[PDB]
């Protein structure tokens, strides 16, 4: 992609005790137009790993196609080895870097969440092959609006319960809906634990508009 077309906004993620939660709204925007209002921007990769993507939705669908086929291929072998979250994140880093280096990027920013061998995994990869791990992540405007809130809570309490992480994510989604003009109040939350990957949705945040009467 040289010129992104239909795009998704922020993806959020946070580690918690026993898992990882990621969130993304269900909108594909076409410039300012809220065009495709019921699309999933999250993929279950395999039992231990999930992915959420900002940016060009066609390129995300391509990655979903390729990655989905890679997991099918591995499962056919029935040999007791599976791609860990970290392995998937590595692969994605290489794939994005390689496409960058051909001056033909996949126009995406991604959040990979996972749970394997008692460890929560949360990793970022961008369209240039910049990749890293952290206890919480937020792409797009989420970097400016949601990440400060995630990090403030994590400083007071680095280990969150599932429910605490889930409530924190809902608070961030609300903030994004108030302040990102490319957001939409219909979203999914995906959780990975010992039990696997669960995608919940469509969800909505309650909103407050009391400030409308507080101009003077």
């Amino acid at each position: 992609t040289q010129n992104p077309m239909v795009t998704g906004t922020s993806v959020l993620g946070v580690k918690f005790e026993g898992g990882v939660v990621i969130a993304a709204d269900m909108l594909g925007s076409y410039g300012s137009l809220a065009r495709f209002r019921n699309i999933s921007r999250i993929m279950r990769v395999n039992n231990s790993t999930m992915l959420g993507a900002s940016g060009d939705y066609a390129d995300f669908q391509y990655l979903k196609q390729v990655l989905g086929q890679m997991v099918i291929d591995e499962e056919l072998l029935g040999d007791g080895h599976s791609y860990s979250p970290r392995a998937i994140h590595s692969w994605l880093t290489r794939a994005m870097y390689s496409r960058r280096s051909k001056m033909n990027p996949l126009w995406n920013t991604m959040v990979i969440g996972g749970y394997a061998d008692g460890e929560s995994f949360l990793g970022y990869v961008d369209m240039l092959g910049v990749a890293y791990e952290a206890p919480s992540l937020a792409t797009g405007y989420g970097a400016y609006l949601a990440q400060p809130l995630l990090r403030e809570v994590l400083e007071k309490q680095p280990v969150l319960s599932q429910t605490e992480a889930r409530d924190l994510v809902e608070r961030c989604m609300r903030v994004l809906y108030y302040r990102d003009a490319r957001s939409y109040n219909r979203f999914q939350i995906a959780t990975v634990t010992e039990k696997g990957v669960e995608i919940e949705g469509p969800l909505s945040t309650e909103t407050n508009w009391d400030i409308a009467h507080m101009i003077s």
């Binding site: 040289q2 870097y97 910049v130 990749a131 890293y132 791990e133």
Partner: protein
Amino acid sequence: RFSPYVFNGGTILAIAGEDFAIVASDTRLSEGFSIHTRDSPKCYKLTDKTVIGCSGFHGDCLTLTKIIEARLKMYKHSNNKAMTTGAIAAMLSTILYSRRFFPYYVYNIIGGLDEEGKGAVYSFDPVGSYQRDSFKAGGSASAMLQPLLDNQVGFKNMQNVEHVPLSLDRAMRLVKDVFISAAERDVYTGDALRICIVTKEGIREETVSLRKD
């Protein structure tokens, strides 16, 4: 138009002693006016005797370190010995030059022991020009660090001062001081300072807290 590069910050420093080398870096990874993470060291262990510091575009830092890792294993397989600090440096110069027309946006400094067991520092530009140094700063705050090292390690501009060998204890104090000074003024340098000390006994690690603003 697409730009294949971004600047991700990072300051690196290496110092050669008589029987040690230090490689140090901050742990902030930045982009634009934002912090990606506060825990991203810029130092990588290559062998028991050699560490490399890498700053600049993180996409290239990650790719280049993985290439170096593969090349060290290939070397060991074909030659039946680990690559020396010097050979790593010479090889890295050629890897960087292979991208002369689409460079790795990476400033590299190698610190390690040479074949006599003495500290060795090699510094590089992005296309692989390099040389051996006594000490060298790279990356975001390098202009802030280097003059103090010139003064305090090189004894430059000082009269009536004995030119003593650099102890590990004094090298460590200098390292911590120049990073604390840099964290005050360079917006990109912060969070924490990671220090690797290479000696004959192995590589040990210290970390010191820096300001988080």
